[PDB]
Design a protein around this ligand. Structure first.
Ligand SMILES: NC(=O)c1ccc[n+]([C@@H]2O[C@H](COP(=O)([O-])OP(=O)(O)OC[C@H]3O[C@@H](n4cnc5c(N)ncnc54)[C@H](O)[C@@H]3O)[C@@H](O)[C@H]2O)c1
Ligand SMILES: NC(=O)c1ccc[n+]([C@@H]2O[C@H](COP(=O)([O-])OP(=O)(O)OC[C@H]3O[C@@H](n4cnc5c(N)ncnc54)[C@H](O)[C@@H]3O)[C@@H](O)[C@H]2O)c1
Ligand SMILES: O=C(O)[C@H]1C[C@H](O)CN1
Ligand SMILES: O=C(O)[C@H]1C[C@H](O)CN1
Ligand SMILES: O=C(O)[C@H]1C[C@H](O)CN1
Ligand SMILES: O=C(O)[C@H]1C[C@H](O)CN1
Lengths: 523, 527
């Protein structure tokens, strides 16, 4: 398999026309999205709404939270389907995901893009790289990795033959997905299912519309009933229920550090009830850096940093939120950042394809981000250089904000904001080595980071010094936009378990191998 | 790339160089006690907490005097290991691999007799059980893991213009605690050695009852070029060690083999301490089993009897993989019972250093002896159990237990469920026409999922049992015994209560001990 092409959406192109039609189709719509257990559409009385982030008067979906009883029925129904699904040849399971990938590439592309735009607030290009390219790539590449894994067999020596069976995990896997990438939800539920597992998928409330579109595509591509249960739910209720089940065998999570730690602690408390040791996989975000050396290409620093910090409103686990600049380059970088900032268009991405980014995801995110802007207006070490405005009357709109910090270890340099808020620390040129140490030591995180420099010795030194500051490390490129099969994604420190989805080893977390030795002569 | 093959098993025939060398090594050890220090860096350290390892078959012989590291020494060992880690992690994988390939060659040749003899005298193994463990399996772990690790670096992502992508297989940031069991010298070497190979630094707490052979392996690794502070040799009280390592902000992994309750305890301690760690520690555990041999009416009776006696009684049944429950159809029970009892009468229990005709020797220690004796007493009292052969034990000289065969009328009796770790085989006879229902009981009776075997010549029965027992055994055997997995041929491990199933012996085990970084370098200015 190869990576899915990124379409250009130029005027008069088939994909631009198809996307505009899909957006028109969605403009006034609310989809009633049920829980799905097997083939049954189930409604509880716990009704919830997903709002369009840039137009919160538009309820894009009405859904409901599964209660503990419904979640337990979903577990039981999934467990009863597991053995036959696990016994299927790997290639037959992979065929479901290859078919889904082709549907997403072609006839369903405009739908999943438009649902990601209207429901999660993405622009055309951000939806395209996510709900199409990244998701399609997860399905195709994981299918390839899984079929290839079957070829990894042990040595046989007569008179015995040895065979490894890549069993699914025994029990069910809980997939808990975040709002910010449609593709992550598809992968969190889809990768374990590919490996013969059955899954309770709790999608993010704020990504419900696009998540259900992916679910339906999987069912239409041939995924049998009870392999993935579509079970929106209150977060704590879902976590309490799955960690209380004797049949839990895995949690595939992406989201905040405290939530992942809480789930880890609940599993540990309940070890005596489980049939086997559950496998926890978590990617937990970052406080990601762009570090500039005086030899850097300033134009690349400026465009890469504006994109990394502000695309999708900075709502990426990989987004740059701390920029380190040498004093010698600061007049150039400050002047260019502030000028380009005034040309950033914030607005409705469905109505204006010129939009750079749109509203943040929901009222809670808006309130958190506003608190950080208020902090930047208060702190003696922080100065807002550009932006700082927000307005939630129509959508959850936050302008891009550029802040300078005189304190390299200010809280704003340490804590993940998940909004369009870039903090810059200007360091003296002769203190670049001490500043590299600050990049490594200042935060709890280890996810992404970039070095911009045209000096080979500097790049080699910075690569060594930052070895554990970033699991995805970039030289003369921006910190966002990892591509499946090219930059397997993840990091350690507080950023999670670093299972590298996007590479060939991720699927090994979702199989528990059995080795069969058959001896052909008497003992 | 690198070419490795399994280490050949030697015959130890009369007059052979290896038999003479082993006899000399045993003669050397017979009256000796080695004083084994803790080793931090290159420093030999003694604490006041003096302990002794006894020879299981002659417990008046203290084979080693060692000491338990105190919390101060454990924390000093952590600090010194962390100060050596970055340079070790930055070494090329092939340079780290060379240490383990050199150690493997030393174990294969000049040190073979030493590590075999120390495993025999200190752990109670016979010649052949020591040979397959302290030589073959350990040598194979070192060579095969070296090959797997060197080849892993060739697993690289796709590059597309204008950028080049490379994966760096970093060691984990922090230190790894390796906690090993008494019953295989090889497991201790792998638990500490595999993480070190991958660029980690390690505190190795060996088993008290395998101390002599464990230190011999440690010294060989150092002589093979392992730098100081990469593996700290820190015997310690178990709970004291676990408390210390799980309280360190720098813990990044625990590589464990032993009992289920100990692993769960460590898992809970890590979870309680999550807010102080720099990263999420990786716990790996293999935790034993209640392993089965299932016999179909079409089985080869001779294979059933020899394979079951070996699996149940070699090394006194003190194997995570040992058969402790035998399921026999009523039609074959007369043939199998008669042959089991006849062959049982020929099993020689004795001193393995003095009599190479010994089948197996004493169990490991007084605690194991006392537990096994309580199970034998339970077999005498229970109305569902009857002792068919064996049943006696005597600890006046060593911890000696006769091999014991018990028949249960209850397939759910506690003796069919709980791991004894002794030479105690329980037999359940089932009606031929209920083989399918009995297969379900094989699957559901215990909490474990480690090893199991089916003996049958009917291909359809084999296929049916293989499907029905898919999650009852991570190492499943068709017409062979449930013990004796070989590195690179049967990667070893299982799920359910048997642990995390990371399959040491196969190519994926080392992935638990690396945290990859991907570097993208872009060669054109951004637009
Ligand atoms: O915040 P968060 O940003 O971690 O949310 C990430 C995902 O976790 C879910 N979540 C939050 N608390 C949870 C819990 N206790 N158990 C399970 N899922 C939970 C959220 O609903 C969302 O799907
Ligand atoms: O019997 P066991 O089989 O659990 O012992 C297995 C290994 O675990 C060690 N151990 C026991 N309790 C421990 C603890 N709390 N922390 C760390 N290691 C421990 C033992 O000393 C031995 O090395
Ligand atoms: O993220 C996006 O949609 C595009 C729009 C702007 O040109 C920056 N990148
Ligand atoms: O921004 C990135 O690097 C990728 C990784 C994650 O799957 C979401 N997008
Ligand atoms: O385990 C051993 O040492 C050998 C002794 C007996 O012949 C069966 N195997
Ligand atoms: O008995 C066995 O199968 C192997 C597995 C473990 O390493 C100890 N010996």
């Amino acid at each position: 398999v190869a990576n899915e092409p990124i379409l250009a959406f130029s005027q008069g192109s088939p994909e631009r026309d198809a996307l505009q039609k899909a957006l028109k189709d969605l403009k006034g719509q609310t989809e009633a999205i049920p829980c799905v257990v097997g083939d049954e559409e189930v409604w509880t009385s716990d009704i919830q709404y997903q709002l369009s982030p840039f137009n919160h008067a538009h309820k894009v979906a009405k859904f409901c939270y599964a209660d503990k009883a419904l979640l337990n029925r979903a577990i039981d129904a999934a467990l009863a389907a597991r053995k036959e699904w696990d016994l299927k040849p790997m290639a037959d399971r992979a065929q479901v995901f290859l078919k889904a990938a082709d549907m997403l590439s072609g006839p369903r592309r405009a739908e999943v893009l438009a649902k990601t735009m209207v429901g999660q607030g993405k622009t055309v290009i951000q939806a395209e790289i996510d709900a199409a390219a990244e998701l399609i790539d997860f399905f195709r590449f994981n299918a390839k990795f899984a079929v290839e894994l079957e070829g990894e067999q042990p040595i046989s020596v007569p008179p015995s033959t040895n065979h490894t069976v890549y069993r699914g995990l025994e029990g069910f896997v809980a997939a808990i997905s975040p709002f910010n990438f449609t593709a992550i939800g598809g992968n969190l539920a889809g990768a374990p299912a590919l490996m013969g597992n059955v899954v309770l998928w709790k999608p993010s409330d704020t990504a419900m519309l696009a998540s259900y579109a992916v679910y339906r595509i999987l069912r239409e591509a041939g995924l049998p009933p009870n392999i993935i249960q579509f079970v929106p739910a209150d977060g704590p209720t879902f976590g309490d229920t799955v960690t209380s089940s004797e049949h839990l065998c895995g949690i595939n999570f992406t989201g905040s550090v405290p939530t992942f730690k809480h789930l880890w602690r609940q599993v540990a408390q309940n070890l005596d009830r489980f049939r086997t040791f559950p496998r926890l996989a978590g990617e937990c975000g970052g406080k990601n850096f762009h570090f500039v050396h005086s030899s850097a290409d300033v134009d690349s620093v400026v465009s890469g940093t504006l994109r990394s910090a502000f695309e999708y409103g900075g709502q990426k686990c990989s987004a740059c939120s701390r920029l380190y600049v040498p004093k010698s380059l600061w007049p150039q970088i400050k002047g260019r950042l502030l000028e380009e900032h005034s040309r950033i268009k914030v607005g409705d991405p469905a109505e204006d394809f010129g939009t750079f980014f749109s509203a943040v995801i929901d009222a809670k995110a808006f309130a958190r981000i506003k608190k950080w802007l208020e902090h930047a207006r208060s702190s003696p070490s922080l100065s807002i250089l550009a932006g700082g405005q927000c307005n939630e009357s129509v959508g959850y709109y936050v302008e891009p904000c550029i802040i300078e910090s005189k304190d390299p270890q200010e809280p704003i340099m340490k804590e993940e904001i998940f909004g369009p808020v870039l903090t810059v620390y200007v360091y003296p040129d002769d203190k670049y080595r001490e500043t590299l140490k600050l990049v490594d030591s200042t935060t709890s995180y280890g996810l992404t980071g970039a070095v911009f420099a045209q000096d080979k010795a500097i790049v080699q030194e910075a690569t060594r010094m930052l070895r554990n500051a970033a699991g995805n490390f970039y030289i003369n490129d921006k910190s966002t936009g990892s591509v499946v099969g090219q930059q397997p994604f993840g990091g350690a420190r507080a950023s999670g378990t670093n299972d590298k989805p996007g590479g060939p080893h991720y699927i090994l977390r979702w199989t528990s191998p059995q080795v069969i030795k058959e001896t052909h002569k008497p003992l």
